[PDB]
Amino acid sequence: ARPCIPKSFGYSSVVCVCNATYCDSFDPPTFPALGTFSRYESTRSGRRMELSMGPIQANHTGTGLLLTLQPEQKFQKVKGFGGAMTDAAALNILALSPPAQNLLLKSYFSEEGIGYNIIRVPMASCDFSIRTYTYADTPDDFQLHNFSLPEEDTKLKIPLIHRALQLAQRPVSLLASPWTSPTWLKTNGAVNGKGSLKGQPGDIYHQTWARYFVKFLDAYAEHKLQFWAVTAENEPSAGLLSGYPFQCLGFTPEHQRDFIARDLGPTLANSTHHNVRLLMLDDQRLLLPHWAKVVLTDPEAAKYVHGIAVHWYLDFLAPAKATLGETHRLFPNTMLFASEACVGSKFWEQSVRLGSWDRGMQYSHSIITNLLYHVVGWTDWNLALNPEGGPNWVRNFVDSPIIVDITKDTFYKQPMFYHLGHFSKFIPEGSQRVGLVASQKNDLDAVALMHPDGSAVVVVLNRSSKDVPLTIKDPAVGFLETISPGYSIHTYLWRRQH
Ligand SMILES: *[C@@H]1O[C@H](CO)[C@@H](O[C@@H]2O[C@H](CO)[C@@H](O[C@@H]3O[C@H](CO)[C@@H](O)[C@H](O)[C@H]3NC(C)=O)[C@H](O)[C@H]2NC(C)=O)[C@H](O)[C@H]1NC(C)=O
Ligand SMILES: *[C@@H]1O[C@H](CO)[C@@H](O)[C@H](O)[C@H]1NC(C)=O
Ligand SMILES: *[C@@H]1O[C@H](CO)[C@@H](O)[C@H](O)[C@H]1NC(C)=O
Ligand SMILES: c1ccc(CC2CCNCC2)cc1
Ligand SMILES: c1ccc(CC2CCNCC2)cc1
Ligand SMILES: [K+]
Ligand SMILES: [K+]
């Protein structure tokens, strides 16, 4: 529909520039003709989800790389893809003119954009806030009579979520996560630092905290927003650390187990929100499988836990097989979900690198890795940040797929945006990952899935500098002859005739 307006800021690739009168967009989604495939291509050299079509052929000869679809080898069903409506994201979006706001929200939530279907919503303040607050700051209010949503929710986050929902054709799922409780519930009496709930699971402090989750869901429901899932705490390990700089609430895995079993599970289950799913952990993968073992081997906690939420700090190394792999082996019926990912958080790296192809490749490589380890969805962190990677009240700045520049009423779509979109746009909720077998060793990263309507989607990432000729074989349908260019990402889509 409208192509990328590219701009270089001196990094390895370009951003696409959007403003009050222009943004890149797709035509309404349509599948290629039967016997035809669609290819969407992005490249470091500057192509951004460009559409081409080719024939599916009956015949194939040669000893080049062959990737054979395994459509009957079925793995996880996908929940979807999205990002976080933090206070920082909301402030940045709303600092744009009304037209630019609309083009930014369409970029993410419309079918002429990349089709996000998940929004993560912080329960009150986090580091990506400019004010520290909870919903119940009046002290000793154990019945939560003074629970209320402030303007950060009622004027910023809620209106934007409603606007996203109006643009989306896909059903959108909301996920809620708290960073801190009110300080009068905490051992340290502060939003940050090392501190946990006072007392022990099953007591008034823990019961009040569980009730706060229901009050939050009730309050959002009065604004006609319902949640798909909540997490039991954002990064519960952080609040166990001396000097933790921003909002946190510390739980050991045993504390989380007992809080879920005695307070949060029962309280949610006895509420009008009993259909809301509960995800445990919401933290870094090196805590697995240990945390899952602690919580899920207790039947009283296990009956309340629908899934395990994991965070991806893409700047740092950690094992995937020994964490996600082992967790799936031990608890194959408990879904894994990636609830936060970010890059640029190291103090010594530029928070925002406008046009970084490398950071784009980090996003898509992480998404592929997550899907190959049975994870059902992937959620970015802040939907938009300023050029400093903020605002953030402790200056914990990071990168974002969309960077807003209010002095030009402009926003920039980073390589990260397109790398995420190669998955989000083309993998509807309910898609199922299927097998994809390589005929020979190769440098590509790839994943295949089947849509609910039976159609095929394959994503191929080439992080090498070399162009790799390859063929995709769909045993029911025929052969796709293609190339994976160096420093590219492709998404292939086709209809599958019986
Ligand atoms: C929102 O962004 C739009 C896209 O950049 C702006 O529209 C562009 O304005 C340019 C300046 O009038 C037009 O001419 C081109 O400008 C570029 C520099 O940015 C030059 O390199 C080109 O040589 C020049 N081309 C010619 C033939 O003169 C662009 O044609 C025009 N693009 C489109 C798609 O309309 C908007 O002005 C901007 N909106 C606001 C409110 O700032
Ligand atoms: C494909 O395969 C066989 C090879 O023997 C041949 O009969 C057929 O005509 C070929 N089709 C095309 C379109 O090349
Ligand atoms: C359980 O549910 C009932 C309403 O069905 C409610 O009145 C009661 O307070 C709930 N119990 C709690 C919150 O402990
Ligand atoms: C072109 C682009 C994207 C797609 C997939 C979408 C998934 C959500 N429903 C509409 C189709 C198909 C063809
Ligand atoms: C490999 C990569 C991309 C393509 C599609 C081409 C790219 C150039 N513009 C026209 C469409 C084919 C094979
Ligand atoms: K209040
Ligand atoms: K940084």
Short précis:
With 498 residues, this protein is α/β, with parallel strands linked by helices.
Helices and strands in order, then pairings?
Elements: E1 6-8, E2 14-18, E3 36-43, E4 50-55, E5 65-77, E6 80-84, H1 87-95, H2 98-109, E7 118-123, H3 151-167, E8 173-178, H4 204-222, E9 229-231, H5 253-269, E10 277-284, H6 290-296, H7 299-302, E11 307-313, H8 321-330, E12 335-342, H9 357-372, E13 377-382, E14 402-405, E15 410-413, H10 415-424, E16 432-438, E17 445-450, E18 456-462, E19 468-474, E20 478-484, E21 488-494
Parallel strand pairs: 5-19, 6-7, 6-13, 7-8, 8-9, 9-10, 10-11, 11-12
Antiparallel strand pairs: 1-2, 2-15, 3-4, 3-21, 5-16, 14-15, 16-17, 17-18, 18-21, 19-20
Helix pairs in contact: 1-3, 2-3, 4-5, 5-6, 9-10
The structure holds a molecule of 3 linked components (NAG-NAG-NAG), 2-acetamido-2-deoxy-beta-D-glucopyranose (NAG) (2 copies), 4-(phenylmethyl)piperidine (2 copies) and potassium ion (2 copies).
Tell me which ligands are bound.
Answer: a molecule of 3 linked components (NAG-NAG-NAG), 2-acetamido-2-deoxy-beta-D-glucopyranose, 4-(phenylmethyl)piperidine, potassium ion
Largest sheet: 9 strands, mixed
Query: Would you report the number of β strands?
Result: 21
What percent of residues adopt helix (DSSP H or I)?
Answer: 10-25%
Which fold name is given in CATH as the topology of the largest domain?
Answer: TIM Barrel
Active site: 235, 340
Membrane topology: Peripheral membrane protein
GO cellular component, one term: endoplasmic reticulum
Disulfide bonds: 4-16, 18-23
